[PDB]
Design a protein around this ligand. Structure first.
Ligand code: OXL
Ligand code: OXL
Ligand code: OXL
Ligand code: OXL
Ligand code: OXL
Ligand code: CO
Ligand code: CO
Ligand code: CO
Ligand code: CO
Ligand code: CO
Ligand code: NA
Ligand code: NA
Ligand code: NA
Ligand code: NA
Ligand code: NA
Lengths: 376, 376, 376, 376, 376
């Protein structure tokens, strides 16, 4: 019913007004593992705790370094479009990564050689837009809801939109630029649109714009869920980085599915920081920060998590439904070190010497890697 | 039942897994006022979203700049003690301010001239401990739960405790220091205690330690709720700063009570930033950040809020119970500018010229200040 | 006619397209003193080199740290109002200092106790508005042009205006705040005004708003040119700081007049940095930056200058008209050390030992201070 | 005659002493486009506003981050040499890029394998010296004036010269280093030379030093104006980056010629910041900074301009002579996105939906890129 | 003989070439107390490890933040003058504090009102020169060696000297400034002197310069060793801060003498950081840094030590001669909390509860403060 912060003979009942409903969401924080210790930065924020920007055509909300200070290199947007609705043609400094959670959308991109790419993106699909290349998103008939990642954390939306530019350009100059009159463009919008209602497009193949510069070298979309996952006992892992999704130079990703009674094994990342989005399910994760520092967090749908470079962690399902979350990295490749596989590949007695345990332990070690394992 | 982010013809239903329960807590964020605009830093964090440290004798949890990056100058602890239980003798770099929310406690402090102050602190009472002066807290028979503020935001607990010092001092040196043998102190704790169980003390007057250095010049405790408040229509405001609570040089405070259907009026602070703790009730606040920037937040019990220097704001009760919250300032005095009183003290026609309104508006302006006002 | 960068046998003629007209403005930079040496930061910027913001009622342009990086603590605005025209009621984080160069204006200010101050300010008059206290400016019949200083350099205008606040506040809340209906304020401006046209006010004494809180302790205006200046041979110096202009806690100022063939003597400032505005005339100044570093600059009307803390400098008139400029300091008092008076107050032979000169030099030293001296 | 800051019913005449001559240089700043909005950092500085360092043999002046704070990654020197005159053998941390505007010069460079490169550089030619590789410049018979760029903005000249090193090395050590006596080097300069007069060299082929290490892999000079430019209607663009000028790893450049009545089209850069030098002509440029922020600047000969990463801009000729300026980038390649070509490669109706315009607009869009366009 | 890093069953002999002589100087670092733990910044640097600047007349060497990064607010110079020798008239941004260790010197200072102070300073005497006020030092017949402290740590000597200024000022300007000819000052030094040989002065009373501005309000010299010290069992403490040495606003100091077999008691400072100079003797000090962090250092003559704000420490004599060292604070007052006196002024049983000890311990506690205690 009413949880209290009490572990054996430690803790006490809360005696002041309180937020019982969040307490129920964070059992491993109201009552942390004995093994937790030391000061650790917050690694947890909820999109439901952010200002939702509402437009005609949908909404957008963001978690940034101003919300989650630990994540300096990475920021995120939860964006929703209604059918036909357009996220306005635009560009950023930051590169853009996306996972399509609900629905479908058509995207356009034009690169620096004037070659265009137009494609339809479904559930489980990704796009990656390189830094500074202009693009757009239009929801199809189901509408669309997707998660966006940008490789800077100071990122507010702070974005360049097509009509915001022209609205703050002398009409004199725009005319000269295109070779028309001032009057011929009297009706340019006096203000940005950002997201706006529009009619559903037609077939993709009818929208494909052909040009003298040719096809682009590598596609900007990736069908993640149509690749053969790494399947282990308690779940699936789908990886997309610059090695298979070529243009994704600055973002490496993994979609992790964890069945009930399963966990993303103890591991860490040797290349860089890990940014997390929880799509569905409930989880806990303890972050090992070295020098006997450790802090445990709770996550569920709509939460952003974080694991600083090289810190040891696990991700454990603690509910009845499957756990589905994204592992995101600002890097050109995915990499992890498995605790199991590490010790498996060392001399038996050496490990035994370290852990004060016998052969009955080293016998269970596996030399294959199993990202997601299941209980007994 | 199920809230959606929809305002008239803007927004759309959520189509991905989500945190309905937080959504219900943040109505003015899932559906913000039309008048909200622009990128504004998060001004909202919940203690229920922090790691609770559990000890024999109670708990402590903290909101810091690592949780709420905007608050660089101020940090807070929610501390709970069981009866008899001692928060260990210690000292910090930071000055310490407190509000006793539940129960009662006995405190000790000794200053830099070797004068001691020992006092009992009840519900509604404050203490202020200057930077670097050593102190302690012991809960009496009801136990104790209080809110602590420290005038640095980078503050982890990162504190100097008496037994942690001696445990990391050569026994050789401790002995020489006091003029005893190594054996006479063989039983010094090999580890810090921090919070620990203990027997209830006796009467205060039996604990008063007398010394050759004399009484301290100004008390370190303040009975806030025994002062005559500023009473206006919709509520009460109790102010304590360096002008009435003399030793409170670096912390100015206000306890604000707002009845249902009432609000803390539109105002701002000309001296410095405002840090907020919500003791009970539910609230919304819009922060006006200049240059047409504004963001609205929701608050309830256990939440920390923030208002950057000089930004315009109001605090409105949006539930059935009274709204009770603290306004905290890193400064030697409390100061606000009331929107009402400002315009009241200007020429009638001048204000009219500004607002495009008539005498039917200027007639309502009041030259007295009413921090908390009530509706119609 | 055509200046070249040539000093004796150093330099050469310019051989690329060039800006002859600026070259003519900076003779001591195109051809620096032999004695100049080393890398020194730019200490010179012109308001004519800034974006002029044009409104109905006037203009405003600013020199900030984004223009002049050396000046981190101080920024400036050149503001112009037409007759009747209002700079909109507003407030800043930064304190505000002003010199009325042309015309006259009426100002209002209300402090944190709800006491109002309304006064008329003429040519040669100052105002100082403490941090966060709300104010306004309205030009009288001649109109008005004045120089503003704010004690932060990162200061863009980034200011809080009255109608910008209300436009980004829920109408629901504004109504409750004042106790009127939504309809009663349907006509509130949907946008800031900033500067706007208005009818000339009436007599000052008819505008004086009386209140229950009383008169303010110290006036916010100062008649600088009606004080007896420090008169020396080549000019006049008028000083206003916290010692005579009481409320001017964070800004110390001097208006310096230098006749032709005269100079502001060799001196430095022991308290803090010096910020300069050149009102009229032409000047040169060499900044001595220690360790044999020295750079000379040219200044004329509309230029901002700067002298980092304690650096040695002189200000010399190099044209036919009087030189009039402001010395501004972020401090509660004015202070200078005169090179002459320094050496005058030391033993004769001691100075002689230092400078390798005789009694024919020490005999000219004066023990009185003469800020501004004249040639032979 | 006398310009005023007046646009229709906005602005007013200047009423204080002022710099009419600079006002005449900045028409689009004294009177900005209506479409300008918001606070934008200064993007404009003039070499004529810098201290000219005069030596026997020529001069050097620099624009740095201390002059133009926005340009943190890039700094520049305007250097002039007389005939025969030597810029002393030296090296920097920063890489060095150059454009030869007037005259000609002979350069030497020796790399880290002891291979030397000696070459003659004429008008329109470039050199690039990698970081830390030692080099020199000697003007031939016409003398020489060139623009230097270094890929750090904090760059003062702060350079290592050959004789400054030896002058601050123990003579004992120098002797041991070369295997001579102290007396054999008694005449080493006791001070740096930097720039000094010297006799004209002979034929290049007579100076070519041959060594056991061999020819260098890629030349350090590039004949820019002997390459076939991108020719469009209103001008020419010559590009040199790491793809054609191999060693130019950290500097990408474009020489842009704009005829009268022409403009460098609306575009932006997706890779990095743009640094500008105006060689001849007069120009205006509006910088689109996103979020409805835009500021217009004026440029002419001797001015440095700047465009932060990805910001939208155009460069328009506003005088009777051709406009010639350099686009400089700290990157290994040149890249731009053309506004025209972007929209050209999108579906017709999609663009129409965005801009609120018809087919009479989309019909003018071109799929080829025309950097420089001409009016009607 | 040969020390090894071995404590009981921990450590091992050194097996690589090593610095046995420093090892002998740092016994408590080669073999630290068991109680040491954790990463702590270096708190120790030796003047013998710095570049000695040699001039005609003496030397100067400095320890700065570039040597000892922990000390950001404070820097020091060891300065030596020969008889008659002059440290050149000069001024700094930083305030200047001094202790005269050997010999004697005459100082001059002139303040901002043109009042001069000239005085003779002996062994055990201090001077304090406020920020930016010009001064000089001349050694008398024994010569002089003194320790200087400046309240900034980034302080190189980076100082303004009188002849460096005039050497980098146009002769034209100097002449106009004083009203003489260029020829009358043809012999001004073309270079700074800094320290230079000179004849011994005469009697002080013959050097006293009288002026129209009057005597200075408070002297700039303090006879420290002629005040009655705090005398305790193992030593003496002489304190000088703004309360007794009035002008010493930004520097608080203590000269501490510790007899053999004695120690500066366990204590900390509640106001600010402690900077240390060891004049004579040998010492060890353990710094308690909180969170179980502690590091022990060794000090002897010529060493600079440091104790960050509020950190617990003791200073123990570990040799045969008395220990003499300075405690320096950037603050307007001296303050310490004694561990003994703290616990002495608390209830007996309360302390007992904390330390797990009995009355046989609390009985030894003293309510008087004894900075320096002696062993048994
Ligand atoms: O989709 C985007 O690029 C955005 O929201 O800024
Ligand atoms: O109470 C305190 O001082 C703490 O928690 O650090
Ligand atoms: O006058 C002012 O305060 C301004 O321009 O921001
Ligand atoms: O040419 C250069 O390298 C310079 O001026 O430092
Ligand atoms: O004595 C001084 O002031 C110095 O050494 O800079
Ligand atoms: Co991971
Ligand atoms: Co407030
Ligand atoms: Co000055
Ligand atoms: Co460009
Ligand atoms: Co101490
Ligand atoms: Na550990
Ligand atoms: Na606005
Ligand atoms: Na020098
Ligand atoms: Na906008
Ligand atoms: Na510990």
């Amino acid at each position: 019913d009413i949880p209290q912060p009490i572990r054996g003979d430690k803790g006490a009942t809360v005696k002041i007004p309180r937020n019982i409903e969040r307490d129920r969401q964070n059992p491993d924080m109201l009552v942390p593992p004995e093994t937790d210790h030391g000061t650790v930065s917050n690694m947890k924020f909820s999109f439901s705790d952010t200002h939702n920007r509402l437009e005609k055509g949908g909404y957008a909300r963001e978690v940034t370094v101003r919300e989650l200070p630990i994540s300096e290199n990475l920021a995120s947007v939860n964006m929703r479009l209604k059918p036909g609705a357009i996220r306005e043609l635009h560009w950023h400094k930051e590169a853009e990564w996306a996972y399509m959670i609900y629905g479908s959308a058509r995207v356009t991109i034009v690169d620096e050689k004037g070659r265009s790419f137009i494609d339809d993106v479904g559930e489980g699909d990704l796009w990656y837009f390189p830094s500074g290349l202009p693009h757009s998103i239009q929801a199809l008939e189901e509408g669309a809801e997707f998660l966006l990642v940008f490789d800077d954390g100071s990122f507010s939306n702070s974005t360049f939109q097509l009509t915001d530019w022209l609205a703050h350009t002398p009409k004199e100059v725009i005319a000269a630029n295109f070779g028309v009159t001032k009057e011929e463009i009297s009706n340019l919008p006096g203000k940005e649109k950002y997201i706006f209602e529009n009619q559903l497009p037609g077939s993709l193949k009818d929208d494909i714009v052909e040009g003298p510069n040719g096809e682009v070298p590598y596609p900007f979309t990736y069908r993640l869920l149509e690749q053969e996952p790494i399947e282990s006992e308690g779940g699936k892992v789908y990886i997309a980085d610059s090695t298979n999704f070529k243009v994704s130079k600055t973002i490496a990703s993994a979609l992790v599915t964890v069945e009930p009674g399963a966990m993303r094994e103890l591991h860490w990342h040797p290349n860089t920081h890990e940014w997390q989005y929880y799509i569905s399910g409930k989880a806990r994760m303890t972050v090992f920060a070295s020098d006997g520092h450790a802090r445990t967090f709770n996550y569920q749908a709509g939460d952003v998590g974080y694991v600083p470079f090289a810190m040891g962690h696990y991700v454990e399902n603690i509910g009845d439904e499957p756990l589905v979350f994204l592992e995101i990295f600002k890097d050109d490749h995915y990499a992890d070190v498995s605790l199991n596989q590490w010790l498996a590949m060392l001399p038996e007695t050496f490990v035994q010497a370290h852990l004060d345990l016998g052969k009955d332990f080293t016998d269970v070690l596996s030399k294959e890697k199993h990202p997601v394992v299941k209980k007994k």
